[PDB]
Amino acid sequence: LESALIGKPVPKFRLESLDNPGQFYQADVLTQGKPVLLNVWATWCPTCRAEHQYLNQLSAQGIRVVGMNYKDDRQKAISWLKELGNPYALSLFDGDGMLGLDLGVYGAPETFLIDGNGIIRYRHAGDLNPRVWEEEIKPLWEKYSKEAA
Template structure:
């Protein structure tokens, strides 16, 4: 009996080590969850009804993210140290005219409000997802994560991790500044809608313009 009890910590340790080794092997093979595309890329934002962070009782629905212009939906929380690291850059983007919507994820409302008061509020709108239900529908792994949503409410891109200048310039900004595709380009297929203006075989998707 004593011998079995003595072995329990070693069994637990071996199990944890095996899980960590498995995850490291997955990451080495390029299966890092931060690099995985959302299954919702190219699809509308999931239907939701959430309260305003600052105004309990005031509800917003999915159409609030369909305003004819692109937005960044930023998933954040006060318990997330990386969210604090990226916050200053979000303030910078907001000051430049980029519309950012915050999704406060599995957090305490009062702490989140104090956070924004002290660090600045980059969000044109703040949604409170205290139970993490919208996060679940979006396939969120954790915080922070940022989704690019076009003017039609369609998810175009997802980034897991901090938003900074490198990420913005290399991953997000090209969507807003270089959405110019030839009509014959297969990548463009399925994107044609009322926001797309074409001149000959050159098309510009205005729903993805940040400025």
């Protein structure tokens, strides 16, 4: 849906790595110099499992995806990745959902497009499928990929 963050930088945060206990990340990790997709997901989200296989496909094509596990059960989340594959370059654990609150998410799943400079450029509330990618996000990803280059 619509977002008041379009054109604004990613909110400050300090979250623990989902699969690397003790390692914490900050917003600087979302300023890669290349565009990135931030995917909000959880194991309790039905369309998330279905969307996971498509994310694996995009990741294999070079699309950079950062995963934000939302108000979820950490262990179940880790098993989820070991069982279905890990498309994420990095996985953040938003156990309390505080980053989700600053991002204005309605729930899961949701995908944000962030440019190389850490500026939020698009927000899609709902599952990521070929149609959404081809019609809504792909054109934007290509634009910011060419500029970052």
